[PDB]
Scaffold this active site. Structure first.
Site, PDB file in Angstrom:
ATOM      1  CG  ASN A  32      -0.366   0.382   2.495  1.00 35.65           C
ATOM      2  OD1 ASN A  32       0.552  -0.264   2.996  1.00 35.65           O
ATOM      3  ND2 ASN A  32      -0.965   1.366   3.125  1.00 35.65           N
ATOM      4  CG  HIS A  43       4.353   4.302  -7.838  1.00 36.79           C
ATOM      5  ND1 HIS A  43       3.341   3.498  -7.327  1.00 36.79           N
ATOM      6  CD2 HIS A  43       3.792   5.220  -8.674  1.00 36.79           C
ATOM      7  CE1 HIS A  43       2.214   3.961  -7.858  1.00 36.79           C
ATOM      8  NE2 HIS A  43       2.439   4.992  -8.677  1.00 36.79           N
TER       9      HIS A  43
END
Length: 197
Positions: A32, A43
DNA sequence: CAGCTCTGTACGTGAGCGATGGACAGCT
DNA sequence: AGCTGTCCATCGCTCAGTACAGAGCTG
């Protein structure tokens, strides 16, 4: 303070968007988003997280990229991104079992849609849940690497790696994970070879 | 008894914090 | 020399899943 005035309370609300196109070779599935990923909007920005270092050392990238380059990954390197859970939390143990299973139904939907060659599970904990929830398979001794089942109705493979998070003591350095990234590079090239016949 | 599930716990690295101090230049 | 401040090197410290033992639980 790493989160430059911006409160932990505010970060928990922020979501991390997916980088998903069609015809990808790889889709990195995180657990998550973490506080820094929700903050940065990219990311694996965590200065300690091994994702980007492992991506370069494996040869999956020409140079050493960082979280800011993540949006250039599909067109240049054939890599996309998503997470088992959309919700931001400081750690992985904050998430409930219902939350994870909600996320697995959503994930297999995104996976059946985009159909990447390889669905990379960046973490074992998440493929344990996904395996039982999606394939009805609870293997007593789960392993890393290519899993025996494909994403239902697709030709998408399931490949598992230890979480790139520097939280697991079992694979303490990034050098301790470059192997799963090298094998991932080899699996891709094999498929990007068997297809060219 | 034997094989489960589930929960509690403990585990290595290296990056980046703030606190501490030493080096050191500026000024009297 | 004496006093003072800034700067930077360095230190302790924190913090980013996985594996497993052992307690309940069930055939």
């Amino acid at each position: 303070a790493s989160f430059n005035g911006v409160s932990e309370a505010e970060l928990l609300t922020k979501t991390l968007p997916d980088i998903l196109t069609f015809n990808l070779d790889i889709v990195i599935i995180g657990i998550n988003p973490g506080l820094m990923a929700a903050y940065k909007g990219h990311h694996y920005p965590g200065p300690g997280n091994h994702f980007w270092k492992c991506l370069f050392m494996s040869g999956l990238s020409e140079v050493q990229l960082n979280h800011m380059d993540d949006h250039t990954l599909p067109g240049k390197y054939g890599i996309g991104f998503t997470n088992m859970v959309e919700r931001t939390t400081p750690g992985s143990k904050d998430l409930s079992s219902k939350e994870f299973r909600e996320g697995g139904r959503i994930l297999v939907q995104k996976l059946q849609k985009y159909q990447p060659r390889i669905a990379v599970f960046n973490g074992k904990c998440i493929y344990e849940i996904f395996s039982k929830e999606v394939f009805g398979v609870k293997v007593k001794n789960l392993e890393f690497g290519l899993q025996p089942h494909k994403i239902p109705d697709t030709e998408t493979l399931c490949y598992v790696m230890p979480s790139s998070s520097a939280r697991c003591a079992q694979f303490p350095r990034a050098q301790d994970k470059v192997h799963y990234y090298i094998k991932l590079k080899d699996l891709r090239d094999q498929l990007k070879g068997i297809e060219r016949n």
